[PDB]
């Protein structure tokens, strides 16, 4: 059931041609010609737009097309239109105990303004919280576009996932996106390291902020 | 192509069973033995749980069950658990250009979950932030249920409404909610006053936390 990786976000400006990849193995995408693509709007019926790797149902724009190469499959959309914004999913027959596996889905955005890198602000544990036998880190992520980032926390140099909660991006006044994440942990774990960091990747570019336990008065 | 009506949503209490119908026709559900069901959390990869009407991938709990009655298909979930909350979709092979069609999905909610009190963690402005002439107090609200709550700020005991931004609650890893409220203010503002507070009211009960101009960090 392990999701075939798909980029969370893909963007382009009107008239541009875009590509969405679906990565699999030789036990599915790569070993069979049974890949399907679906167009979907949150809280709506998925719509099959490509079956058996390259076949398109009558009624589906010819601007959409499916391809496969090696263990990766792709859905290419040329002449991007505002209406084309949706979530696209891929799926493939699989030889395992699960007949068909799906991709994590890709949210397609049609650029309505230039790409904007995220602003990150990291807040360390407040003494009051520590002096309550509790520790928590907060990482604020605002003003980015398209609305999708990947967040990873680091205990000095090692990534930490347990104890991490990250919200999905929501559109803000200015049309850009905001999101937040926090790392829960013990005061001991906090003082235990040289630092903790919040890494936010956006469109292949990473922004990292750091904090460190500092003994005061 | 043709759709498959499913109830928009359904609910039940722990230990109860539920049924989700997939009203089709002799051209789809009743025309073949190829009905599938999927579990899905918004933003993630759909998981196949029933296929060929009654078959089930091993690894999927036997509490989930698929059946057919003429042109309508059903998903029956025995002894509901909190963990079963998700969106469920059906699909079926179909005559016509489109090989498979899907229902609009049903959102399953599990009632009776235990009420939980939110833990409020109040953060003083970020050093990097204050250093950039900006100041933001962060009131992190986590681990509460149901996901409804109201916030209120105070400056040296007086209500403050300007510069307040409060996000809408979202579920976390556990089946509990998390939300935040932000208070914007200038650094001079942060120093001038002495005690800013964040009052969170969850289900009648009201918890509050406070902060003030630190000294070292």
């Amino acid at each position: 059931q392990s999701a075939l990786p798909q980029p969370a976000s893909v963007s382009g400006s009107p008239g541009q041609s875009i590509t969405i990849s679906c990565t699999g193995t030789s036990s599915d995408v790569g070993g069979y010609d049974l890949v399907s693509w679906y167009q979907h709007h949150p809280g709506g019926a998925p719509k099959l737009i490509i079956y058996e790797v390259t076949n398109r149902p009558s009624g589906v724009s010819d601007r959409f097309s499916g391809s496969k190469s090696g263990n990766t499959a792709s859905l290419t959309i040329s002449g991007l239109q505002a209406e084309d914004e949706a979530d696209y999913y891929c799926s493939s027959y699989a030889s395992g105990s699960t007949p068909r596996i799906f991709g994590g889905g890709t949210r397609l955005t049609v650029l309505g303004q230039p790409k904007a890198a995220p602003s990150v602000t990291l807040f360390p544990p407040s003494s009051e919280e520590l002096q309550a036998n509790k520790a928590t880190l907060v990482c604020l992520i605002s003003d980015f576009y398209p609305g999708a980032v990947t967040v990873a926390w680091k205990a000095d140099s090692s990534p930490v996932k347990a104890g991490v909660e990250t919200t999905t991006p929501s559109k803000q006044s200015n049309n850009k996106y905001a999101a937040s994440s926090y790392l829960s942990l013990t005061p001991e774990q906090w003082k235990s390291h040289r630092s903790y960091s919040c890494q936010v990747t956006h469109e292949g570019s990473t922004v990292e902020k750091t904090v460190a336990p500092t003994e005061c008065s």
Side-chain angles (χ1 to χ4, degrees), chain A residues 74-143:
Chain A
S74 313
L75 170 78
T76 307
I77 306 175
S78 57
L80 270 175
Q81 301 188 192
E83 62 162 61
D84 299 341
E85 292 192 310
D87 283 1
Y88 294 80
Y89 293 78
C90 64
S91 85
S92 168
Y93 161 69
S95 49
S97 54
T98 296
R100 187 162 283 264
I101 310 295
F102 290 74
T106 301
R107 177 151 298 179
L108 182 67
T109 304
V110 170
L111 302 180
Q113 65 182 297
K115 290 190 183 63
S119 288
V120 195
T121 302
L122 186 57
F123 301 66
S126 60
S127 61
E128 300 84 314
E129 196 189 13
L130 288 156
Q131 197 169 58
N133 205 193
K134 264 185 180 175
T136 302
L137 288 158
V138 167
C139 186
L140 298 187
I141 310 174
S142 50
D143 312 301

